[PDB]
């Protein structure tokens, strides 16, 4: 439940149109971080920057988001699991 200070996001459970922030500080690994972004079985929005937001996530936007970020001790750090579930109009689990 413990993030790096504040996380990029924690979780959104919805039908497609979830609310996602992807966020770290960036350089080529000096102070701020150089990176590899992935999510929990799914592709992430473009990647490789520092701070990006997905205001409405579609089907390939469903999974859990995580990031491998290296800084100035040449050390790779991991930033938080942001879990977004974006369903089709709903399959028989919630109210059906």
From Swiss-Prot:
Asked if the record carries the keyword Nucleotidyltransferase, the reply is: no
For this UniProt record, the keywords arranged alphabetically read as follows:
Capsid decoration protein, Capsid protein, Late protein, Virion
Where is it localised?
Answer: Virion
Q: Which GO terms describe its cellular component?
A: viral capsid, decoration
Its chief place of residence is virion
The Ig-like domain covers which part of the protein? 2-93
Domain statement: The N-terminus binds to the capsid proteins with high affinity and high cooperativity while the C-terminus displays an IG-like fold.
- Subunit comment: Interacts with the major capsid protein; each hexon binds a single copy of the decoration protein.
Any idea what job this protein has? Answer: Decoration protein that binds asymmetrically to the center of each capsid protein hexamer after capsid expansion. Stabilizes the capsid and protects from DNA release.
Protein name per its UniProtKB record = Decoration protein
Which portion of the complete protein is shown here?
73 to 164 of 164
């Amino acid at each position: 439940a413990l993030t790096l200070s504040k996380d990029l996001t924690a979780s959104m459970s919805v039908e497609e149109g979830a609310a996602l922030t992807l966020s770290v500080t960036a350089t080529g690994g000096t102070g701020p971080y150089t990176y590899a972004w992935t999510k929990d079985g799914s592709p992430i929005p473009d990647a490789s920057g520092a701070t990006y937001t997905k205001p409405t996530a579609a089907a390939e936007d469903a999974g859990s988001y995580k990031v491998t970020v290296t800084d100035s001790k040449q050390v790779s750090k991991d930033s938080t699991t942001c879990a977004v579930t974006v369903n089709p109009t709903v399959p028989g689990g919630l109210e059906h």
